[PDB]
Swiss-Prot record:
GO terms for molecular function: DNA-binding transcription factor activity, RNA polymerase II-specific; DNA-binding transcription repressor activity, RNA polymerase II-specific; RNA polymerase II transcription regulatory region sequence-specific DNA binding; sequence-specific double-stranded DNA binding. This is Transcription factor ETV7. It is found in: Nucleus. It comes from the Eukaryota.
Length: 76
């Protein structure tokens, strides 16, 4: 329920591995269908430039809550 320590940095600094870790953490945290781990093959700087519509394109069932989760982490 608490964010993994490696993800406790501004997301623009996340590695590609961190992004994948984040998606797996979010799927567990939100009970999501798990069909999203391989639609964000990019690091955090790339992830942070995607729009909400891009998230919906890449994760049609969960993109909005993933985007909103990322937006919250960007405030931390």
């Amino acid at each position: 329920s608490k964010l993994p320590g490696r993800l406790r940095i501004q997301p623009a600094l996340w590695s590609r591995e961190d992004v994948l870790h984040w998606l797996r953490w979010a799927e567990q945290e939100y009970s999501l269908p798990c069909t999203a781990e391989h639609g964000f093959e990019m690091n955090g700087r790339a992830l942070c430039i995607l729009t909400k519509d891009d998230f919906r394109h890449r994760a049609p069932s969960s993109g909005d809550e993933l985007y909103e989760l990322l937006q919250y982490i960007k405030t931390q």
